[PDB]
Amino acid sequence: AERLPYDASKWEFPRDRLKLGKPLQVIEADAFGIDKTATCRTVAVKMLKEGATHSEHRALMSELKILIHIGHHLNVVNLLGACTKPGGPLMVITEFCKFGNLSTYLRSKRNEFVPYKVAPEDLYKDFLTLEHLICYSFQVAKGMEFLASRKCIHRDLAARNILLSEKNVVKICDFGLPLKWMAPETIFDRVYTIQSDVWSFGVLLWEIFSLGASPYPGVKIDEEFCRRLKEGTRMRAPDYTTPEMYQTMLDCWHGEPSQRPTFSELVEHLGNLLQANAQQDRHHHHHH
Ligand SMILES: Cc1ccn(-c2ccc3c(c2)NCC3(C)C)c(=O)c1-c1ccc2nc(N)ncc2c1
């Protein structure tokens, strides 16, 4: 629905308080006074091109309203304000994640990975570890549990739509071959649901534990691909996975949408795996 309310007094931001920067249309920019926390803050802006159809305007507006309605969550790009009143183009302003999409970031740390650290820890400064990977998965799962709980369906959950912020905090965003993230029922029936988002999460898991690889490596995405997918064929375990994570991937990819775990179960499961890994890490650190 678009019937959602827009509270101008709370969200409206003056267009001349922004200084548009480079493209990420989604642009990066400097916003002055959008925060009572400072005077100048870097932010991201999604705006309508100068052409923009009337229906295209209504679309960006509905996204804005949904962002307002949903609310704040540490693992979802948070809305900061908007320019909707007459005088300029419609603009939606959110926090900025300087490190970019998770896929690209993981791709750049392939030579900087160890399963876990021990002394001397300095030999692994800013390296990725199993803790990091499971932690990104845990956060995205909490973000999705947050959205599913509000009847909000992503429709394009993939590593490219996950942003990396400071302190290894990841956020779910939406820049809005994509068939590779789509569940069987989405491809053959054009059905989108929380469950089909669970399928996508599984593919995201694979991406995270392959360190930014492209799903279904060396496979043409044609009719055979879709046929085999519906028939039960699945990607093999990626290079940096743990046995439990791979099985969570298989669970997410179950043929029956209703047999896949819910995001609450995944949040619960990933949480336990995160603690087990951490406990294991303490022993590895202590003994060596
Ligand atoms: C500018 C902008 C506006 C709306 N949404 C957006 C759209 C839909 C949704 C969210 C955020 N979050 C929840 C959901 C799926 C409803 C966004 O991700 C972004 C957006 C896009 C790229 C970005 N890139 C960086 N580096 N930093 C912040 C970004 C923010």
Side-chain angles (χ1 to χ4, degrees):
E2 69 254 42
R3 305 149 185 176
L4 294 168
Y6 176 64
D7 185 326
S9 296
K10 173 175 186 174
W11 301 104
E12 195 76 10
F13 188 72
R15 295 195 179 80
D16 71 17
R17 284 303 191 72
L18 294 173
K19 304 197 66 167
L20 300 178
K22 53 172 181 162
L24 294 183
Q25 44 181 159
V26 191
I27 318 171
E28 169 182 29
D30 285 326
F32 299 72
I34 192 166
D35 264 351
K36 205 171 181 181
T37 290
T39 45
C40 183
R41 168 177 185 172
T42 294
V43 298
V45 182
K46 187 183 290 187
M47 57 183 263
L48 277 185
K49 180 183 174 177
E50 264 314 303
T53 308
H54 160 293
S55 63
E56 298 182 297
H57 181 290
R58 205 166 193 177
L60 184 46
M61 262 300 281
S62 298
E63 186 178 305
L64 162 57
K65 293 175 181 172
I66 290 195
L67 291 173
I68 288 165
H69 181 75
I70 295 176
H72 168 76
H73 192 278
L74 187 50
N75 300 127
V76 171
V77 169
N78 301 124
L79 174 75
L80 298 184
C83 303
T84 73
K85 282 176 173 175
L90 172 48
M91 291 184 269
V92 184
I93 320 171
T94 76
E95 55 178 302
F96 177 64
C97 299
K98 56 171 179 173
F99 298 127
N101 89 84
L102 189 55
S103 178
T104 298
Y105 177 80
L106 297 185
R107 200 107 41 58
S108 78
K109 309 288 294 185
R110 303 207 167 172
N111 289 159
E112 290 172 343
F113 169 93
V114 277
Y116 59 85
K117 315 185 181 188
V118 293
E121 283 167 333
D122 61 52
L123 196 54
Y124 326 114
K125 177 184 178 182
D126 304 318
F127 263 42
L128 283 179
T129 63
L130 273 180
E131 165 152 279
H132 291 73
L133 305 190
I134 302 178
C135 192
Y136 296 148
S137 305
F138 181 48
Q139 295 180 59
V140 176
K142 289 190 301 188
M144 284 311 299
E145 177 188 46
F146 174 68
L147 294 180
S149 289
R150 291 171 176 60
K151 290 163 68 185
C152 189
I153 301 169
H154 203 294
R155 295 164 74 86
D156 191 31
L157 187 54
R160 61 189 144 73
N161 275 319
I162 301 306
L163 304 177
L164 180 62
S165 213
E166 306 67 58
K167 307 290 191 177
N168 293 113
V169 164
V170 289
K171 298 164 184 294
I172 301 177
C173 83
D174 189 358
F175 279 89
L177 298 176
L179 292 179
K180 295 192 295 173
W181 285 264
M182 290 164 75
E185 68 269 23
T186 301
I187 293 180
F188 293 98
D189 303 331
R190 281 186 179 290
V191 172
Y192 288 79
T193 71
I194 295 181
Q195 289 73 52
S196 69
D197 269 351
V198 162
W199 173 288
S200 300
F201 185 70
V203 179
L204 172 61
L205 285 183
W206 191 92
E207 284 185 280
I208 293 181
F209 292 85
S210 64
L211 283 190
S214 178
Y216 302 98
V219 172
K220 188 179 175 182
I221 301 306
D222 58 11
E223 292 242 291
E224 288 312 297
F225 165 75
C226 300
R227 201 210 78 202
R228 281 184 276 100
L229 201 63
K230 181 180 70 178
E231 240 135 61
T233 303
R234 304 292 182 264
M235 278 185 279
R236 305 180 204 179
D239 297 347
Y240 308 78
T241 196
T242 61
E244 300 94 314
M245 205 60 59
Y246 182 54
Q247 182 56 59
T248 290
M249 277 173 223
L250 296 182
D251 295 329
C252 290
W253 303 330
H254 193 296
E256 274 303 308
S258 73
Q259 288 307 305
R260 304 170 188 151
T262 61
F263 283 119
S264 283
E265 289 167 344
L266 293 164
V267 161
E268 187 53 40
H269 189 55
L270 299 182
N272 289 162
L273 292 182
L274 183 58
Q275 288 175 188
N277 187 69
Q279 202 199 188
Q280 288 165 20
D281 276 15
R282 270 182 268 105
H283 287 81
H284 307 316
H285 194 275
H286 186 62
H287 299 169
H288 313 93

